[model samples]
Target: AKWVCKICGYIYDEDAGDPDNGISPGTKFEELPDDWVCPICGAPKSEFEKLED
Candidate 1:
């Protein structure tokens, strides 16, 4: 699954979690912390929308 930041159109791929942001690979969206944010746009988790397929 992938999540897109509506604010900046940054895609967060679950298969490749943001390692630079402290999220390791294979991390799930539900495993992300509440404080997790978009690395490119600084958008909150709530601002990320799930991408189908």
Candidate 2:
């Protein structure tokens, strides 16, 4: 499963994590701050969707 940004197609992975965005490895996507933004495209949390693949 993953949290995908709809606007820029950024995929947030729990294992790899978004270290560049202050999200350390092992941090779950659902554990992210509500105000968190996409590091690549600055998309808001509301602009993302949960995908289970």
Candidate 3:
């Protein structure tokens, strides 16, 4: 499963680096850092959600 930013559609792959330090690899969407901004579009992590289909 992968989380994608609704704002820019940036896919957050677990194989990649930790979205935010101190968070585990399998962390859920709500558990991500509030300050975590999209690397591509600068959108907040809150703008992301688990991609389902």
User: Among all windows of ten consecutive residues in candidate 3, which has the lowest summed lDDT?
Assistant: 14-23
Clashing pairs in 2: none
lDDT of each: 0.94, 0.85, 0.71
- Cα deviation at 9, candidate 1, in Å, is 0.6
Off by over 4 Å in 3: 18-32
Q: Write down the worst ten-residue block by lDDT for model 1.
A: 44-53
Question: For model 3, how does the per-residue alpha-carbon lDDT over 8-49 read when each residue is reduced to its tens digit?
Answer: 878877655464555567766565667877777998776878
Which candidate model has the greater TM-score, 1 or 2? Answer: 1
lDDT of 2 by residue, 1-53 (tens): 58889999989888888887788889887788888899989988889888885
Residue-level lDDT of model 1, residues 1-53, one tens digit each, is: 99899999999999999999899999999999888999998989989899996
Candidate 2 has its poorest 10 consecutive residues by lDDT at 13-22
TM-score of 1: 0.93
lDDT of 2 at 36: 83
The candidate, 1 or 3, that scores higher on lDDT is: 1
Best by lDDT: 1
